[PDB]
Amino acid sequence: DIRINYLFTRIVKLIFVELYCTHTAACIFYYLATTLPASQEGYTWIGSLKLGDYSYSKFREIDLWTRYTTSMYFAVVTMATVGYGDIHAVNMREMIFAMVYISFDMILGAYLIGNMTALIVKGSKTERFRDKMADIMRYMNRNKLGRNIRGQITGHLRLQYESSYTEAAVLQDIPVSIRAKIAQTLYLPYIEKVPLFRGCSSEFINQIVIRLHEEFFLPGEVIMEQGSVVDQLYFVCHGVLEEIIVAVLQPDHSFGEISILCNIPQPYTVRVAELCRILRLDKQSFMNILEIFFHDGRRILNNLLERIKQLESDITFHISKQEAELALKLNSAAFYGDLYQLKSLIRAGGDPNKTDYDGRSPLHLAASRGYEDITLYLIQESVDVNIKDKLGSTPLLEA
Amino acid sequence: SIVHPDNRWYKAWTMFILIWALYSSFFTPLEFGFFRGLPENLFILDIAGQIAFLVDIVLTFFVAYRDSRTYRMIYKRSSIALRYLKSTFIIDLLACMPWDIIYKAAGEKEEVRYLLLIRLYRVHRVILFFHKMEK
């Protein structure tokens, strides 16, 4: 069973076995006293026994419940290897049984200690936390970090001490394909509620859940500063934040999206008010996803509107320019004859048949510089031959 | 008023009462078994030993909870009292009433003297101290 630790269960099993053999050895020991005639009861361990005032003379009518405890009291003392000598074997048949019971229990006693050590050697939360602080304190001392920063790094380590975290270096064994489905189950409900992604396609949103990371911030910490360049995009999922007080941030919201879109420095400082869980997204990963979903990108800018006109004009201008820019990149590669450079922007780029602002098919530049090898590849794409620029010329006219 | 549990006086108070925790957890078995009524030679000591554990019952109503979910603080009055009255107020007050005086002035019965073993609970304060040393 996984609910309870298996090492702890193994400890309980050994205790039951040891306490059961003690019970059995107590009943056998009393039998070795009754296997002698009543006239020779003075040669038995209990027949000759005499405690403080009790005599144990008859030994056969002694109110059994106080005849079993005496026998069990002998077995428990021997089992724990204490030894009193008030009760001990006297004749030959009780010495032999004592030798095999003591020898058997000696091996069993050392077996319990071995399993007790294995339980401790696994570790604990305090032991793992203490090791991490040893490295961090040593790391910060050698770099002479400021006292203010030392208060934040040590604060986050105590935060993960209680309320056990994800236990890193363990989930990494999970394959990325399976972990991809795990992210959707957890992070999807929080993302869908943000105003920015209202009406966005499911395919676009799914590409964001895969590449998100989860972080915690203690109250009083600062995530962004006024005038700073924003390099991350944060989605608020838990707690409350206050923007500096000019605004208050609630869960199922996002902040910092203004800076990352209009290239404007961050105008406000975000302050943590209560313990919050934050999902972050990098700048490089965000733009790569946004570029592919060109249709979804327009909706994000439109939803953000509901400087605004300049940002809206820039967003519409950004999507307009990118189509023309990729045409220039292909023509430059064809001009210098770099076959491999243009190969990457054909299978996952733009249409080579398109022309730039002036109008320059790659066949024109290829025919002007006499690059025979590149001409073969353009035939494979079935690029039109009679394409004319705004001059009346033809690609065959340059050759 | 409310006092944050760090201002170099509440910590000195808790460390001062930890000395009484050691005394009252080692002396309780010594009067339950050996003594049978706590003679008058140490009558003042019994009364004096419960004063330090009685002011703390009414001085623990001025603390900070930290709320254990949003680690900022708690300063309201209803939250502090409801927190303490639910966790250990019943057992701290019960282990503070005089049982030696009750036992003798009740037609002495051995049954009513078993309540002294409730006072063994305050050895947990010493155990909590060792946990702080581990961290």
Curated annotation (Swiss-Prot), chain B:
Membrane-spanning segments: 15-35, 43-63, 87-107, 114-134
Lineage top rank: taxon: Eukaryota
Regulation: induction: In roots, strongly inhibited by 2,4-dichlorophenoxyacetic acid (2,4-D), abscisic acid (ABA) and benzyladenine (BA) treatment or by potassium starvation.
Positions on the Cytoplasmic side per record topology: 64-86
Signal sequence region: none
Extracellular topological intervals: 36-42, 108-113
Tissue expression profile of the protein: Expressed in root pericycle and xylem parenchyma, and in flower at a lower level.
Subcellular compartments: Membrane
Role, per record: Highly selective outward-rectifying potassium channel. Involved in potassium release into the xylem sap toward the shoots. Assuming opened or closed conformations in response to the voltage difference across the membrane, the channel is activated by depolarization. The voltage-dependence of the channel is abolished by internal or external acidification. May interact with the cytoskeleton or with regulatory proteins.
Quaternary structure (record): The potassium channel is probably composed of a homo- or heterotetrameric complex of pore-forming subunits.
Comment field (misc): Loss-of-function mutation skor-1 leads to a reduced shoot potassium content.
Family per record: Belongs to the potassium channel family. Plant (TC 1.A.1.4) subfamily.
Entry's free-text remark on domains: The segment S4 is probably the voltage-sensor and is characterized by a series of positively charged amino acids. The pore-forming region H5 is enclosed by the transmembrane segments S5 and S6 in the Shaker-type (1P/6TM) and contains the GYGD signature motif which seems to be involved in potassium selectivity. The KHA domain (rich in hydrophobic and acidic residues) present in the C-terminal part is likely to be important for tetramerization.
Name of this protein: Potassium channel SKOR
Organism field: Arabidopsis thaliana
Residues shown, of full length: 73 to 207 of 828
